[PDB]
Amino acid sequence: YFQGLMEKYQKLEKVGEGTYGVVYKAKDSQGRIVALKRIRGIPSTAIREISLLKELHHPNIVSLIDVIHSERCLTLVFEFMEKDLKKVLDENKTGLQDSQIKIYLYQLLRGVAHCHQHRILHRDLKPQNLLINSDGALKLADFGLARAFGIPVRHEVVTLWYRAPDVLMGSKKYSTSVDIWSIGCIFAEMITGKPLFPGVTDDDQLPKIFSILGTPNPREWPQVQELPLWKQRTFQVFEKKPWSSIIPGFCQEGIDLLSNMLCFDPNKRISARDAMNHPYFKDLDPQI
Ligand SMILES: Nc1ncnc2c1ncn2[C@@H]1O[C@H](COP(=O)(O)OP(=O)(O)O)[C@@H](O)[C@H]1O
Ligand SMILES: [Mg+2]
Numbered sequence: 001y002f003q004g005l006m007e008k009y010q011k012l013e014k015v016g017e018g019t020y021g022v023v024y025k026a027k028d029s030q031g032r033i034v035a036l037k038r039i040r041g042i043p044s045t046a047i048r049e050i051s052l053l054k055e056l057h058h059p060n061i062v063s064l065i066d067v068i069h070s071e072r073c074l075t076l077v078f079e080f081m082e083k084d085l086k087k088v089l090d091e092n093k094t095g096l097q098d099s100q101i102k103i104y105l106y107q108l109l110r111g112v113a114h115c116h117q118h119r120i121l122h123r124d125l126k127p128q129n130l131l132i133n134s135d136g137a138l139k140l141a142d143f144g145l146a147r148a149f150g151i152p153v154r155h156e157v158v159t160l161w162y163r164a165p166d167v168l169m170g171s172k173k174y175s176t177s178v179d180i181w182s183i184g185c186i187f188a189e190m191i192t193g194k195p196l197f198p199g200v201t202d203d204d205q206l207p208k209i210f211s212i213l214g215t216p217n218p219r220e221w222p223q224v225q226e227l228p229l230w231k232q233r234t235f236q237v238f239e240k241k242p243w244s245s246i247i248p249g250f251c252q253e254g255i256d257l258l259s260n261m262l263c264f265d266p267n268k269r270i271s272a273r274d275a276m277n278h279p280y281f282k283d284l285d286p287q288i
């Protein structure tokens with residue numbers, strides 16, 4: 001049993017795990033099911049997370065309903081979600097059904113557009129941080145690395161598989177573009193069931209991106225040369241693999257949308273809102 005500011009919660013089964021604690025299923029005194037994310041320098045990270053979550057009230061963003069403070073641990077109380085996208089991809093090793101890719105991508109874009117409109121960047125979008133409930137609603141979660149505009153950035157070993165090439169090259173500037181890259185990586189992962197850029201080491205990351213989309217050309221994107229790592233490193237020059245080989249047989253409008261998400265120049269990359277209005281979503285009800 002745990003006492004919050006809003007209600008009392010009865011601990012049930014462990015429904016997840018994490019770097020600083022365990023996520024459990026839980027029950028309200030009145031019966032309503034919830035999630036308890038237990039958090040063990042670390043209290044500052046949890047405080048940031050709560051403050052950002054309290055600014056983000058949207059159907060496509062995991063709802064924070066309460067906080068339990070204990071000398072030992074900070075417990076976040078969320079609406080319950082049955083699964084996550086990593087778990088969904090594990091059951092579909094060769095990709096998802098086309099209608100589902102379309103549903104999940106639209107909701108992922110809508111949640112991110114809400115973030116961006118509220119001047120917050122997620123910065124850690126990946127299938128395990130994309131929660132899916134018992135009704136198929138996709139919601140953003142884990143705002144642990146989120147960045148509010150104008151607030152300075154303040155370390156855990158995480159995957160660089162969804163990180164934008166300019167960020168991996170040392171860019172530190174605030175850009176909504178960093179999230180759209182991750183969305184592109186996720187979009188491609190939902191098509192094949194496999195990660196688009198799974199570099200073997202943190203060092204292999206940029207050569208892995210470049211091996212698929214080509215090595216960026218400074219005449220096309222002049223600002224590459226201005227980036228820190230581009231100055232202190234030499235990269236093997238690659239030609240872009242055709243989309244016909246990356247995502248074989250996927251619809252033309254989906255390939256066009258993906259290509260606008262995965263372009264190197266952050267100033268040319270499609271925004272979350274413009275991507276929602278792309279011909280690829282023509283048939284989809286926006287009121288989902
Ligand atoms: N609202 C929720 N409902 C159910 N399970 C959840 C919920 N939030 C998180 N989880 C589960 O536990 C993991 C929680 O870790 P997360 O929220 O991403 O924190 P972290 O990765 O920082 O430790 C998730 O990836 C998921 O498997
Ligand atoms: Mg996480």
Ligand SMILES: [Mg+2]
Pocket residue numbers: 018019020142144
């Ligand atoms: Mg965390």
